[model samples]
Target: GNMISAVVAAAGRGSRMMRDMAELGLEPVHKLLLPLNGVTVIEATVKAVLSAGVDECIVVTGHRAGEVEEALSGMDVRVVRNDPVDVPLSASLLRGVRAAGGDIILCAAGDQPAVSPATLRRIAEHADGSTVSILARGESGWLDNARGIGMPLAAGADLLRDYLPLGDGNINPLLWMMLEDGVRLYGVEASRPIELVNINHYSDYLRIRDHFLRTN
Candidate 1:
């Protein structure tokens, strides 16, 4: 069996969501804990990865880490606290990567509840000991302009280690560095536009919630 580990980065302050809540006359809340149907956003995101049958799952949490960890209490996941919680996303990524154990690693944002197990499996299956990612195709039909849905990223443990210390502010530059360094990078097309949607604000949550209601 292919040993696979998953890392969910859910350490942001979710400032946008808080701001939106204030404007909407609602109590400020952590976006990850926001209810989508019956489950919290992070719960759905973690469930998606778990459904894909990974060997291990690591959640990197900060800014209300206790609450987020509590929400995932029953799930088979290891929680790693991100120090200096205000650092860029790469900091959380590094924390998760360090805690992960497997030949292949899958990374995703904790806010992307729309990611599906099937898509995660597809990306992992496509990885040939390199980097395989799910990319959202733009309206122009160019896959190059595609945005990552935050799941379906498969990279070898060794490859990830090489850049772990280098991840500072963003992930895109690291991705480009890998590409430029001749790392075998492959892109898997997303099945639908909704798969790429990420929840950053209350509006984003409402949009996804409405979409799910309509589709379900």
Candidate 2:
């Protein structure tokens, strides 16, 4: 049986999310800890990814790593700490890649609690053992106003570990740099932009909150 590792990238301080939380007079904590119906954001994210039939799940923790682990209690995920949590997201991502026990790895932000299992399955449909398959808009690979993509990605463990930029950089740009350098990568078009939302702002959080309410 082939194992597929799903990395729940939740290690960052979420500076954008924290800033919005403070503006709204709420305690600035990891957005993954935000309540989503009966579960935390990361909990639901893990549940969704697991439902996609990934053999293993990895949660990369940083900032408040302890609290993030506590929030994910009872879930089927291996939590790995990204100490300091001040490094570029590429570095945190590499940490997860380094710990992967599978040949193919899928990763996405832990704050995207509403991403459906179907969405992941569909993206996986485009995945190959030899190349990177990324979720993106229908017309192009870019997302988040051209920030480049990575909310959901499927690639060989070594490809990511060796190809993804290491030293200092935002993950999206670093990944895009690989493509620019002719690395094997392609986009799995999203039906809509919101499908890639990572809850970077309070307004974005409200969008996810409303999704829960609507589904309720």
Q: Of the candidates shown, which would achieve the greatest lDDT relative to the real structure?
A: 1
- Candidate 1 local distance difference test against the native: 0.76
TM-score of each: 0.89, 0.88
Candidate 2 clashes between residue pairs 3 or more apart in a chain or in different chains:
none
lDDT of 1 by residue, 1-216 (tens): 268898888998888889999998999889999887577889989998999888989999998999999999988899999887886777787788889878788888898787778877777666656654544443312123224433447778777777756845677667766666777666776666676777777888888788778867
By how many angstroms RMSD does model 2 differ from the true structure?
A: 2.8
Stretches off by above 4 angstroms in model 1 are: 138-152
- The 10-residue segment of model 1 with minimum total lDDT is 138-147
Compute the lDDT of residue 177 as modeled in candidate 1.
68
